[PDB]
Amino acid sequence: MGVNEVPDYHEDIHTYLREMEVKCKPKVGYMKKQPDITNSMRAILVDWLVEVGEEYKLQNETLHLAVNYIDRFLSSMSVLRGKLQLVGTAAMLLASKFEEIYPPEVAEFVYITDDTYTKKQVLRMEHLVLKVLAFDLAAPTINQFLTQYFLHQQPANCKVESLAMFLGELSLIDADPYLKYLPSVIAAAAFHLALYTVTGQSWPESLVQKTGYTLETLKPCLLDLHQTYLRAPQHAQQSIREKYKNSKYHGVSLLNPPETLNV
Amino acid sequence: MENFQKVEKIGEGTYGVVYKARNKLTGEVVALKKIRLDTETEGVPSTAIREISLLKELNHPNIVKLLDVIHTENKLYLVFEFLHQDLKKFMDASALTGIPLPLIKSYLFQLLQGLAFCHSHRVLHRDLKPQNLLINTEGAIKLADFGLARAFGVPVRTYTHEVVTLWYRAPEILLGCKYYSTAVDIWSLGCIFAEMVTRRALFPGDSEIDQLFRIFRTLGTPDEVVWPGVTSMPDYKPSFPKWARQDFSKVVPPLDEDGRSLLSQMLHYDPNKRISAKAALAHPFFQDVTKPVPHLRL
Amino acid sequence: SMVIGDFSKGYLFHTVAGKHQDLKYISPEIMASVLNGKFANLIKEFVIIDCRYPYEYEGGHIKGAVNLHMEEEVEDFLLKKPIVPTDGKRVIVVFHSEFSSERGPRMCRYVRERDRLGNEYPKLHYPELYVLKGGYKEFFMKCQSYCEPPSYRPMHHEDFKEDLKKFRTKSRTWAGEKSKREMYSRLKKL
């Protein structure tokens, strides 16, 4: 509240983020252009990144930024299977250097790598990722829009916020079909789904004016988010469910998804 | 690199030394800032990464321009547009007669526009001081040295504590506030504003405790009425001296009523009640702002 | 400004303008005269902390200087057992480095901060801190007589690069650990 919520620039910052998320958007369906990796390897890598971030107590913004960097790098560069983890590590490192007050050292990133890549290799890959991304490391993420959306709920409910974060992180694992949705749309769908699941409310009328997103235009993303919320227990990658079972996240992954959507 | 013909070099030693070079083919004067990565055991520094990432989006007349980045596995070169001198050098050269009031008004207006542009793009400069403000011959002042800049969220989180230069550090950072925001930058401007009027630093402290005592001496010791929640701050002690607020007539004599009111709003204790860059541009102090040309003695 | 940190008297040395306006500088001529016996009666102790790395210390330094390249070392040497002054004399502490731009000023600021923390305002153990203007390079150029051994070892020498990287890593690790500990102590009692 007050200068913490930036009341003079919040609308300007939101408009700037909306205009920026188009530029930092990865190419849709870049995995077809990749002749050695598919979406399963990407999902495994993102799950491993979630586990790594949970190990070092990194921010969720770091993980979202790292996944964005990985997607952008792969959308313009072709890598082999054995190198994929390396680029992930590099992206994570870069994300930390952009977000964390105390980012982990390169030695730690080689350690969690399990010594399949050396420190020189990690630094070379970091240089390559920085060159390919053209130092465009400031990218809007689902976290950045969800955090702004959380200010429009009255009364506040930390369970809703934690469930929205959990759904937004679940959307990170699967490239299909969340590569075709902007971070703002996924954040809006996650916020509405969390509100419906926890308190039974819907997409606020103060947010349809701010973002222009009605419940009708959020439906294509909402259906997919609901489908993979229902299928979360059966997913091969279960690191996010374990991470969000903790009491700091209010055990949101232990909740029951709604049987049907009132949309 | 070989494309740029080095002409002059300023910055004693190997400490972010900059080179005034000229483009060989187009004859453009640029400033090359050198960053070492062979001596950096952890790759590209976080400060350089943040500065390059955030300066590529800030396109304003009052923000320094990052023309190009020369990327090499052992060296990093940041190419900036060349500006003749910083504001500290200008004040030192103009230490006898002082900076004329219309020039101070124009410089403050331009700095506030640049800060408003920075804040509307979620960037926190966090290193605002006269050494980081670059002027030119035409009469334009620009923010520079975005190495300490950061991109914040709405609302902000807990960020880096040791950021602003001690002379221009906000009282909320000194008192160890959990959250700081754009109001940290405005305070700096306020201090710079006073430094432009009185030709001397407003709060020249040699330590955090001395800096807090100087701020309290000039503006009065805060309490729960002026700054609610100040008594429960981690770095606040109930043993602080109970000083009285000095009237701004003696703090900044040359300033008029409008300038005094703007300075008092910029130096507000409570970050919530502190003025913003966007709201400062609408102040009556800038009713008759005109842009003069500095003499540029140096 | 024009008074020492405890606000009791002015600075004895002829101050020189420097890169940092926070601190008070002295050109190598003043320290050359001081080491030549110019203020024997008015100065009780004269400390010249060589804030450079030890491999620079072995490559030439001012006579009577003490090499303290770490903040913990300086706190141990200066503040754990402070040099008690008396009436009629003053204790002057001079910091320097290769160029007196990053390391010497940082050590001077750290000493002032730790002296303020450990005392009651405005009492200070070392109210007179100077930084040698131009660093050790200018002193070597102008006062090579007092530099034993008469040699100059740059920080970015083609040799001792591993030592420089190790020392930088140690400084970075210490600063990061101190910052994290302070942040935790602040957030536990916010």
Numbering used by the authors:
A (entry chain B): 168 to 430
B (entry chain A): 1 to 298
C (entry chain C): 335 to 524
Extract from the study:
Phosphorylation of a conserved tyrosine (equivalent to Tyr15 in human CDK1) in all eukaryotes, and additional phosphorylation of an adjacent threonine (Thr14) in metazoans, located within the glycine-rich loop (G-loop) of the ATP binding site, inhibits CDK1/2 activity. Here, we present the cryogenic electron microscopy (cryo-EM) structure of CDK2-cyclin A in complex with CDC25A at 2.7 Å global resolution.
The CDC25A catalytic domain bridges the bi-lobal structure of CDK2, binding on the opposite face to cyclin A, to form an extensive but discontinuous interface of ~1260 Å2. Substrate recognition by CDC25A is driven by the CDK subunit, and this interaction is mediated through three distinct CDK2 regions; the G-loop (connecting the β1 and β2 strands of the N-terminal lobe, residues 9-18 containing pTyr15), the activation segment and the GDSEID-αG helix motif. The αG helix and preceding GDSEID sequence protrude over the CDC25A helix that lies C-terminal to the mutated catalytic Cys431Ser residue.
